[PDB]
Amino acid sequence: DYKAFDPELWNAIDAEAERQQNNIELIASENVVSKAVMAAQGTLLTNKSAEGYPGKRYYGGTAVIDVVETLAIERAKKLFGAKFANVQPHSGSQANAAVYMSLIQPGDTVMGMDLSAGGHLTHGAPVSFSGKTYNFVSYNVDKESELLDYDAILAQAKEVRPKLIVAGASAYSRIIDFAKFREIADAVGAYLMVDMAHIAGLVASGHHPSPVPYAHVTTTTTHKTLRGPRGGLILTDDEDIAKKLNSAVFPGLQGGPLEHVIAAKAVALKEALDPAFKEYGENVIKNAAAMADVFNQHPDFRVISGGTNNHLFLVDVTKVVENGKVAQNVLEEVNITLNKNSIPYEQLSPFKTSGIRVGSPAITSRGMGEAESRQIAEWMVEALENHDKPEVLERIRGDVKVLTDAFPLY
């Protein structure tokens, strides 16, 4: 009994397993990985250091590690249709750090999505290494439509003359035209990086256009929609850039890779290669649409861009609670975690925001469908209309338990 040595730690692990079961996870980044993905991270591959790349290791005894990493590498190439993959990045933050390091120089100018319109921290926030190391100039969505305007971007690009354009977002609901982003990049002589961390699973599933054929380099996380272990991944079709990327990940930015997590990457990528992953993607698309329909129909809420063609959507809540932070707290009391979130052309402080961000991938991996998704948005609408009224929140929390009980987690 290894658990018996450390009850304080393993009682917390049980408490979290319980907490998850009794919690509706609507946070768009979140998912529920298979038992195989978890099992793989908990193997004795943690024991073995593999500084270097397959058949170019610093150390010996690395023959079987090369099989595991080469599987992961080959499975990502096959799934995403890329000539080159690096599976060693510890996180999406590090995968992004390696691409910047490979394509541009400290102080060089970079275009990323506005951080209220769907841009990521790592796409130029001044509190991120990304902001501090490079000159980031944001491109917005159109104010009226809340859509990417490829004409407006192209004209801004022509003035800013960036060395690099970043596309991909964590709060944009609509299909990105990657062909148009590359057309713009080519129009001004810049690289295109696509950070697809949010949509990588929808890309695996067929439901989002691939940026792989259009981006010079594509980064993603292996967690989020792709539903793998916590980590990062870099794809490219350019052999010269693959060489630079490999160098930047190690020994540029990282030391030894987490080969146990890389075994969980290989596993999860094989799961994404299965026809059942197409079904999952389909249900991610429907479940999010079902939830968003409910906010569309209700007069006191506006969905950003009018709806969604991916795993998530934002809602302006400001007609019903003071701000997004309030919205967020209220729903935690009914055992529904989402997150406050900026909306295009945000008026309020970044700590308050005008919006909530809903996502479908977690409830979808639990086995929930459109009925359940609609039900959960009605509950969100009731709880938020009745933020004042604890007797009301208390009834809803009891209904949430009925539904969580109904849909086990593992």
Ligand X SMILES: *Cc1c(COP(=O)(O)O)cnc(C)c1O
Q: Which of residues 95-134 bind its own copies (CB under 8 A)?
A: 97, 101, 106, 121-122, 125, 127-129, 132
Per DSSP, the three-state class of 313 is strand
CB atoms within 10 A of CB 33: 22
Q: Quick check: 116 and 345 in contact, CB under 8 A?
A: yes
- Regarding 341 and contact with ligand X (CB under 6 A), the answer is no
Query: Binding residue per annotation — 253?
Result: no
Residue 30 annotated in ligand binding: no
269 is in an annotated binding site: no
Residue 194 is a binding residue for ligand X (CB under 6 A): no
Long-range (24+ apart) CB contacts under 8 A made by 361-364 are 361/28, 361/30, 361/31, 361/201, 361/224, 361/225, 361/227, 361/284, 361/311, 362/25, 362/26, 362/27, 362/30, 362/31, 362/32, 363/24, 363/25, 363/26, 363/287, 363/407, 364/280, 364/283, 364/284, 364/287
Asked if residues 299 and 277 have their Cβ atoms less than 8 Å apart, the reply is no
**Pick 120 or 260: Cβ nearer ligand X:** 120
Is 256 a binding residue for ligand X by CB under 6 A? The answer is yes
Quick one: which of 62, 116, 128, 170 contacts ligand X (CB under 6 A)? 170
Binding at 60: pick from ligand X, its own copies, none (beta carbon under 5-8 Å per type) = its own copies
Interacting residue with ligand X among 52, 103, 120, 182 (CB under 6 A): 120
Q: Which of residues 250-309 bind its own copies (CB under 8 A)?
A: 251-256, 258, 260-261, 263, 266-267, 270-271
10 to 49: interface string for ligand X, x by CB under 6 A? -------------------x--------------------
Q: Choose among 116, 24, 26, 117: nearest CA to 339.
A: 26
| 349 known member of a binding site | yes
From CA 203, how far away is CA 207, in angstroms rounded?
6
Report the binding-site residues for (6S)-5,6,7,8-tetrahydrofolate: 115, 119-121, 239, 349-351
- Name the site residues for ligand X (rule: CB under 6 A): 29, 91-93, 96, 120, 122, 168, 170, 195, 197-198, 221, 254-256
